[PDB]
């Protein structure tokens, strides 16, 4: 108790604008603060909250003092913001709120899906089926099985061409699966291209 | 400039002691110690006002702290033991408790055994053709397998250059066995060039990880070689292929 | 698939603005629009969506073709609000969300939980006890046993006197319960106030 | 004026035959009927466009349509069975499948076996003293219970007149029996006023339920009174005490 | 008479707090309320003022029904706030104030007082003088001469820069001023700037 | 969704009849419409309680009334005339004579006499260099003259897009004849920009002035264009200069 | 400059509510006060003001360290308020702004403006004119002829009969005037009585 | 208890020295000394931290102090001159700059010529019949005229007692030449009692005005008597005329 906070996750299109609101149960509260904290480094500050509400820049935050409760308004997201976010109240000796996490997710022009098969260096062979360039809306999730590993989505970016492209892998000892069984247990796109030979 | 704090990583035996320091560069006069776990914000444990200050938070266990000098707020556990792994930060205020410049951080873990700490096996995927033949650009897969703590750091270096322009890693280690209280952990790691810049033999591409374990006085006695802060690596040279 | 939505409920103090983003897969869609809906009655249209951007007023939506998603933005929330809010595309045959719903909350000026007992009207008793005035931020759960029911908070509003107060009620057949130990499965204020006599 | 949508509540047995009204007064082109169950958006079961149209959406199983005069689209079903048991919205607009204005709604219950509907049992709760004084103000409560479907409207009345300020009804029906999927519903009801008002005893109090369940000519052949559409109510006079 | 009420302009810089104040004369009054109204527009409810006095939030609001008052207080003002505000009162078929105006003026940091001088598109080029950056301990007046006409201090708000300037217009029938005697009616910071060529 | 109300303008002869229309959405009972002037408040013309009422507030002169559907009620004059000339408000009540929902308003101007009805000149003045090259930021001024009576809509469309940051439009017309009771209105307008943008010459700059006059069914015998209801705009490109 | 304080003076309706504003320039200024000055007499400590925003009690201080603002608010005001408010703050070396005069003005409820002639005592009898009675909405201002002599009005309490007067007192140097003349130069209601005999 | 502070009142010619006695009762380490004038709040001219201090605020000309019981914080000026006229207020303080206590004040004039020294002329008027006679309350006024400076205290004494209730006086003289820098000041009273009570004739009413101009030992060369400090008083008894 002490201090609430959004839950579960925000994960929205890159250009929509988040809204954070924080509740305090003491009245006696002195000063409020927004943190953010990327995965997994520090807290590093991001907003002093005001009674008088803020203005700059891009990010808003006010305080309602009455109703207790403080916001925070990020208007225009962008795929750095995708964070945790950290609702600071001194009461007294300063509570941290455990967070809200917020994952920007890009969107991607022309996603033509795919689950390539790339091959071990060195020897062995082994395996990794590469799930990418889908769009952001495809949600990827476990297997039925525990002896394959599946990793959630990662976003990429190549500067020097703007182009970005989510990614997904998953791996399993030569039992033997192969990249076109692989994420059975997720909601692949209706046009998941299978290369075999 | 900054607020620093050391060391980034560490593994302690149950009963064996350590001494985390926060130095300040900003001759401020509060410092603090929190402690970071899951499902709950961070918690203090000491905190400083000057330079003979103590207090409060959630002191026990074994959490004492001095404060000789202004820069230096010095936290030390003097009988380390499970719980107490964790995450710890550290904070420096000119205020009283106002602005906090957080340090980069603590990953302890303490393990009442040496014997399941493991180094990370890593190899280097290369990109399967397909991919060049149709989106005209290669993507080297990363792997890390079998290593605990999660205490690694991952990155890619084409041609004696550290790069990030086109990378992406996992933010958080796999678990191998998610029932397990000490799982093994995994993690996995993404670098994406243009297909022509593939083909370029001359092109070289390596996935370096830092893994973070045992010291040197450590007492190991297992078979396996000392798992000690090492670097492990992978390559793959260019394929016109 | 088709048009996601954002999840969970949004629940948030009263004087708050909120955000609402919707995700069309079918690039070539036509026609957007906003509905609310109250619970539980009909679909009542809000906004039309254009890519101008909107204005009236409160409310804010907005078109990114680009993007190919549509928002919300409800600022200076009023209880009344409180409804399933449901983003429509047409798309050749015009598809309805599935909804997100917003549960406004009050917040509570002079908080004193209590849980009294009122006495049946004729005779038998029965007996009910009643949960109120208790903070906005505190959740009342059902129980334990499948003979005891339990209703979740109920913000109940009395405009004569400016004053909006919590209320949720639980009663049984005699186990014998008593009001004592109703709400045991629910976090309740460390001085929440038990009548007797 | 606006979209009139009759009727509001029906329980059917499983090879029945009723019809749905949708009353138009736009003067529209277009007329659609929807179909909303939990988990899901609406779900189109059939529209016309003039006097003469029928189709899209997915109008299995039995949906038969009409459009006749240009403000009445009917919306029917010549064997109600479950599943069926939905809340149904009729609509309009002059668009095409643009801006549409939407009826109050159906919620409509097809069961098999009519034996397990209940007529409510409405009971009024009078305020506790220890709340009284304290609060100088005062609740009752009312109270529905044991009925199905959850087809009921819950007033409150004071002095012959229903208020809607200080009122708050549960926005849901609460399982008696949350096992078994047909289970006997609850409801609850607060009506709070100062504690000036419930003292004066020349107030009347009176706690309304309105319940839609079988109709005349409808079989019924149990030892108990026929569940038909009917009122329940229970009083309660403000008292000194 | 009946619902008087503050009366002229409120000109207050951008930190401050402010004080309506509206008094009625029929002691059987029955319920009040505040509306807000930005030029010109429709008035929006703003507050219901109840004896006990209200709450949230930057706005407060209450009201004595002994000495018969009804008073309203924004602390920490912004510009948004500029708009007229008006005292409703019931007590019988609710009489509507005749509200008064709320003028925040905006604090400057760095302001260098200039008049330049616009020169037409097309042709003829008229002649347009633009008094601009000044503080706001800055009055524009209106001018000696009829054949030129002069806009009192407008606002303006470089969102993408958090920028803030103040501006007055000013214009004429070729007589043939010049921007330096254009504003002799007024009173210029002793620096201002003015360059001709 | 709201309270709309039409017309947003209009210009009446003496002796012209015409109708408002406030539509209320919100299925409420009450409502209202008022009359607004300068130096006094509000002043209620009709309401209705239902679907049939009328009567209090101030009606005379020429102020009927309407309301056959209850989410519309009509206020109309039979005959207009000086004065009558004023800003009507209509609004909407679920209470009685408790919070109200007012709708955009309307501006009407009645004239014995409509050869003074004037439509404005828009004109667009290029920055100044004194100011770029001391500010490194330009300002745009647009001035719209001789228009009578008020009612105009200016904007700023910046490369096909209207943009409301950077500009400020006068909160108040002007008067070109201070004495004479039906003076001329001017308007002035500024937009600012970060001199890069002023002096790139792909950058478009138009001003935009939505005027209101006559209507169709009006007479004109004036040497003049009819000042109907027109768009006046004056543009300007980015000056590399 | 420095400290900056409301300029002149805040002549306020006895039921009133009033705002006070204070503005200091040193970000890093540690602790903040309102002093009260009566007429004309000593500083004596009112409040000292807190971030948190004071308390009591009819008397209400606020601070807010990020806009850099002060404010005190008196709600009610009484006319036993009227004083010289002094906004002090401690900047190293404890600082007194200038300060603002308020002038709470008593409510005549029932006022009947008469100009009564009191003849003098001893001899000479010179010339006394007395003009009494009227609301606080009339208004007094000096004299043309300088050999002629006009009080500002001046605010009486008949505290035992609860009744509040309001005078103002003419006299000249045989020139020679009476009662009917005397306060010519104000805005002198319809209804003044005028007892010549 | 508190702190006191000396003189009050007091006239001097150009040239002429004096000082200032402010005492300290609460045992207090800081004392400060003030001035305050028109058009700017108080200025600080010295103060001390202990027992041996001087120095800030502000102190030419001739101001200079002296500190050395501590509970004695003494004020003078060598060569008095205008400015210098100015009303001066002692401070005592506990702690630090915080909360301060100021003494009563002083009210000095420096002129370089006394010759335009002037004691008041006080007289009472007997309420206008015309007043009893329709508010049935009777205003007694009195009048101080020639005074220079405003060194006064107005007072009424009714039976020889001094009232508070019902009186009321100019807050500010009123300058009988608005030219004049010197100008000769003048000040008027009000006492409004009821009817009946003035018309009591044991009641006594006495305006009185204490003036405090020159002293004993004061050069003095006019032919006119010395403007001493001084007490006028005016008389008037109940009529029951």
């Known amino acids: 108790k002490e201090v609430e906070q959004d839950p579960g996750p925000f994960n929205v299109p890159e250009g929509a604008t988040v809204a954070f609101n924080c509740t305090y149960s003491?009245?006696?509260?002195?000063?409020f603060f927004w943190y953010r904290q990327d995965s997994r480094k520090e807290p590093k500050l991001l907003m002093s909250?005001?009674?008088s509400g803020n203005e700059d820049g891009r990010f808003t935050a006010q305080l309602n003092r009455a109703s207790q409760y403080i916001s925070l308004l990020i208007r225009d997201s962008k795929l750095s913001d995708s964070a945790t976010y950290l609702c600071?109240?001194?009461?007294?000796?300063?509570?941290f709120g455990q967070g809200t996490e917020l994952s920007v997710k890009p969107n991607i022009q022309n996603p033509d899906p795919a689950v390539y098969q790339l091959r071990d260096s060195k020897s062995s062979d082994k395996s990794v089926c590469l799930f990418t360039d889908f769009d952001s809306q495809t949600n990827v999730s476990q297997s039925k099985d525990s002896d394959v590993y599946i990793t959630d989505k990662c976003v990429l970016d190549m500067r020097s061409m703007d182009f970005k492209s989510n990614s997904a892998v998953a791996w399993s000892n030569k039992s033997d699966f192969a990249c076109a069984n692989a994420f059975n247990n997720s909601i692949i796109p209706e046009d998941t291209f299978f290369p075999s030979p | 400039a900054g607020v620093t704090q050391t060391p980034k990583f560490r593994v302690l035996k149950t009963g064996q002691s350590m001494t985390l320091l926060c130095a300040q560069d900003?001759?401020?006069?509060?410092m603090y110690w929190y402690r970071q776990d899951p499902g709950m914000g961070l918690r203090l444990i000491h905190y400083?006002?000057?330079?003979?200050?103590?207090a409060k938070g959630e002191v026990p266990d074994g959490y004492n702290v001095s404060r000789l000098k202004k820069q230096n707020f010095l936290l030390g556990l003097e009988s380390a033991a499970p719980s107490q792994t964790s995450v710890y930060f550290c904070?420096?205020?000119?205020?009283?408790?106002?602005?906090?410049?957080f340090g980069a951080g603590t990953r302890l873990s303490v393990l009442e055994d040496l014997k399941n700490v493991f180094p990370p096996e890593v190899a280097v995927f290369e990109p399967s053709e397909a991919e060049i033949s149709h989106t005209q650009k290669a993507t080297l897969v990363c792997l890390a397998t079998g290593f605990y703590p999660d205490h690694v750091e991952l990155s890619w270096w084409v041609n004696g250059k550290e790069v990030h322009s086109g990378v992406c890693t996992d933010p958080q280690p796999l678990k191998e066995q998610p029932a397990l209280n000490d799982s093994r952990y995994a993690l996995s790691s993404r670098l994406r060039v243009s297909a022509t810049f593939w083909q370029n033999p001359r092109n070289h591409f390596r996935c370096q990880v830092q893994f973070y374990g045992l010291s040197e006085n450590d007492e190991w006695t297992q078979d396996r070689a000392k798992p000690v802060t090492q670097i492990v690596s992978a390559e793959a040279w260019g394929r016109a292929d | 698939k088709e048009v996601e939505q954002d999840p969970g409920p949004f629940n948030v103090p009263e004087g708050a603005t909120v955000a609402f983003n919707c995700?069309?897969?079918?690039?070539?869609?036509?026609?957007?629009?906003?509905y609310r809906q109250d619970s539980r009655k009909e679909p009542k249209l809000?906004?039309?969506?254009?890519?101008?951007?909107?204005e009236d007023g409160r409310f804010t939506a907005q078109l990114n073709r680009a993007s190919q998603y549509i928002s919300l933005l409800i600022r200076d929330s009023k209880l009344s609000d409180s409804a399933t809010?449901?983003?429509?595309?047409?798309?050749?045959?015009?598809?309805?969300?599935?909804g997100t719903e917003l549960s406004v909350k009050p917040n509570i000026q002079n908080p004193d939980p209590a849980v009294y007992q009122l006495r049946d009207s004729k005779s038998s008793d029965k007996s009910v006890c009643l949960f109120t005035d208790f903070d906005s931020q505190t959740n009342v759960s059902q129980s334990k046993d499948s003979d005891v029911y339990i209703t979740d908070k109920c913000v109940l509003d009395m405009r004569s006197m400016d004053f909006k107060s919590n209320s949720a009620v639980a009663w049984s057949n005699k186990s014998d319960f008593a009001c004592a130990n109703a709400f045991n499965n629910s976090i309740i204020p460390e001085d929440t106030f038990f009548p007797s006599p | 004026a606006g979209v009139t949508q009759t009727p509001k509540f029906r329980v059917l047995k499983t090879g029945q035959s009723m019809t749905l009204l949708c009353?138009?007064?736009?003067?529209?082109?277009?007329?659609?009927?929807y179909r909303q169950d939990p988990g899901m958006g609406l779900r189109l079961?059939?529209?016309?466009?003039?006097?003469?149209?029928?189709?899209?959406?997915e109008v299995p199983d039995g949906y038969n349509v009409s459009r006749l005069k240009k403000q009445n689209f009917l919306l029917g079903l010549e064997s109600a069975a479950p599943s069926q048991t939905s809340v149904?919205?009729?609509?309009?607009?002059?668009?095409?499948?643009?801006?549409?204005?939407?009826?109050?709604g159906t919620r409509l219950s097809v069961l098999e076996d009519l034996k397990n509907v209940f007529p409510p049992e409405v009971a009024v709760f009078e305020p506790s003293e220890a709340e009284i004084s304290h609060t100088q103000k005062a609740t009752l409560v009312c109270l529905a219970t044991g009925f199905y479907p959850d087809h009921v409207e819950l007033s409150w009345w004071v002095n012959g007149k229903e208020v809607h300020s200080g009122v708050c009804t549960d926005p849901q029906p609460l399982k008696e029996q949350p096992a078994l999927n047909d289970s006997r519903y609850a409801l609850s009801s607060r009506l709070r006023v100062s504690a000036t008002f419930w003292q004066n005893p020349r107030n009347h109090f009176r706690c309304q339920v309105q319940f839609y369940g079988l109709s005349e000519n409808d079989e019924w052949t149990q030892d108990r009174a026929k569940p038909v559409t009917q009122i329940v109510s229970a009083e309660a006079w403000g008292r000194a005490d | 008479k009946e619902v008087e009420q503050d009366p002229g302009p409120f000109n207050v810089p951008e930190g401050a707090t402010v004080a309506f104040n509206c008094?009625?004369?029929?002691?059987?009054?029955?319920?009040?309320?505040?509306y807000r109204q930005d030029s010109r527009k429709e008035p929006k409810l703003?507050?219901?003022?109840?004896?006990?006095?209200?709450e949230d939030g930057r706005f407060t609001a209450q009201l004595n029904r002994a000495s018969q008052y009804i008073s309203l207080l924004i602390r920490d003002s912004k510009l948004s706030d500029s708009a007229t505000?008006?005292?409703?009162?019931?007590?019988?078929?609710?009489?509507?104030?005749?509200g008064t105006e709320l003028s925040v003026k905006p604090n400057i940091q760095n302001p260098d007082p200039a008049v330049y001088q616009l020169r037409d598109s097309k042709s003829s080029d008229k002649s347009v003088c633009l008094f601009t950056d000044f503080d706001s301990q800055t009055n524009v007046s209106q001018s000696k001469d009829s054949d030129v006409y002069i806009t009192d201090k407008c606002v303006l708000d470089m969102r993408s820069m958090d920028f803030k300037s103040n501006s007055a217009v000013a214009w004429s029938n070729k007589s043939d001023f010049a921007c330096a005697n254009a504003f002799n009616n007024s009173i210029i910071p002793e620096d201002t700037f003015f360059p001709s060529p | 969704a709201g309270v709309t109300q039409t017309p947003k303008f209009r210009v009446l002869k003496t002796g012209q009849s015409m109708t408002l229309l406030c539509?209320?959405?919100?299925?409420?009972?009450?409502?209202?419409?008022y009359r607004q002037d300068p130096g006094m408040g509000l002043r209620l013309?009709?309401?209705?309680?239902?679907?049939?009422?009328?009567?209090?507030?101030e009606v005379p002169d020429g102020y009927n009334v309407s309301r056959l559907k209850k989410q519309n009620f009509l206020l109309g004059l039979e005959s207009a005339a000086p004065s009558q000339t004023s800003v009507?408000?209509?609004?909407?009540?679920?209470?009685?004579?408790?919070?109200?929902?007012?709708?955009?308003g309307t501006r009407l101007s009645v004239l014995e006499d409509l050869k003074n009805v004037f439509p404005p000149e828009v004109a667009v003045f290029e920055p100044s260099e004194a100011e770029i090259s001391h500010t490194q930021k330009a300002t745009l001024v647009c001035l719209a003259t001789g228009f009578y009576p008020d009612h105009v809509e200016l904007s700023w469309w910046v490369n096909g897009k209207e943009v409301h940051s950077g500009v400020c439009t006068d909160p108040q017309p002007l008067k070109e004849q201070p004495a004479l009771n039906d003076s001329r209105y001017a308007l002035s307008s500024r937009l600012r920009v970060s001199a890069t943008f002023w002096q790139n010459p792909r950058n478009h700059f138009r001003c935009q002035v939505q005027f209101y006059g006559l209507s169709e069914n009006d007479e004109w015998t004036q040497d003049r264009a009819k000042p109907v209801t027109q768009i006046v705009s004056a543009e300007a490109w980015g000056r590399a200069d | 400059k420095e400290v900056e304080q409301d300029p002149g003076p805040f002549n306020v309706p006895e039921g009133a509510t009033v705002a006070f504003n204070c503005?200091?320039?040193?970000?890093?200024?540690?602790?903040?006060?309102?002093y009260r000055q009566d007429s004309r007499k000593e500083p004596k400590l009112?409040?000292?003001?807190?971030?948190?925003?004071?308390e009591d009690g009819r008397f209400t201080a606020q601070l807010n360290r990020a806009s850099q603002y002060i404010s005190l608010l008196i709600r009610d005001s009484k006319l036993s308020d009227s004083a010289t408010?002094?906004?002090?703050?401690?900047?190293?070396?404890?600082?007194?702004?200038?300060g603002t005069e308020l002038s709470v003005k008593p409510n005549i409820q029932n006022p009947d403006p008469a100009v009564y002639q009191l003849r003098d005592s001893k001899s000479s009898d010179k010339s006394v004119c007395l003009f009494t009675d009227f609301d606080s909405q009339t208004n007094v201002s000096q004299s043309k002829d300088s050999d002629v002599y006009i009080t500002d009005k001046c605010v009486l309490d008949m505290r035992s009969m609860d009744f509040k007067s309001n005078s103002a007192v003419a006299w000249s140097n045989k020139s020679d005037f009476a009662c009917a003349n005397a306060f010519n130069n104000s805005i002198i209601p319809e209804d003044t009585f005028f007892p010549s005999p | 208890a508190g702190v006191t502070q000396t003189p009050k009142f007091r006239v001097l010619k150009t040239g002429q020295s004096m000082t200032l006695l402010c005492?300290?009762?609460?045992?207090?380490?800081?004392?400060?000394?003030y001035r305050q004038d028109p058009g700017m709040g108080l200025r600080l001219?010295?103060?001390?931290?202990?027992?041996?201090?001087?120095?800030?605020?502000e102190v030419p000309d001739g101001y200079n102090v002296s500190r050395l019981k501590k509970q004695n914080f003494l004020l003078g000026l060598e060569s008095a001159a205008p400015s210098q006229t100015s009303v001066?207020?002692?401070?005592?303080?506990?702690?630090?700059?915080?909360?301060?206590?100021?003494?009563?004040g002083t009210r000095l004039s420096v002129l370089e010529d006394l010759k335009n020294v002037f004691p008041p002329e006080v007289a009472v008027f007997e309420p206008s019949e015309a007043e009893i006679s329709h508010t049935q309350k009777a205003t007694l006024v009195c009048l101080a005229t020639g005074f220079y400076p405003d060194h006064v205290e107005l007072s009424w004494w009714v039976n020889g007692k001094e009232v508070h209730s019902g009186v009321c006086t100019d807050p500010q003289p009123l300058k009988e030449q608005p030219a004049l820098n010197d100008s000769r000041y003048a000040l008027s009273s009000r006492l409004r009692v009821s009817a009946t009570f003035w018309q009591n004739p044991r009641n006594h009413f006495r305006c009185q005005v204490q003036f405090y101009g020159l002293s004993e030992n004061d050069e003095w060369t006019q032919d006119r008597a010395k403007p001493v400090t001084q007490i006028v008083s005016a008389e008037a008894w109940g009529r029951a005329d």
């Open positions: 400083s006002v000057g330079e003979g200050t103590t």
């Open positions: 003491n009245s006696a509260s002195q000063s």
């Open positions: 600071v109240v001194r009461a007294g000796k300063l509570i």
């Open positions: 904070a420096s205020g000119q205020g009283n408790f106002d602005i906090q410049y």
């Open positions: 909250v005001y009674s």
């Open positions: 900003m001759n401020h006069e509060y």
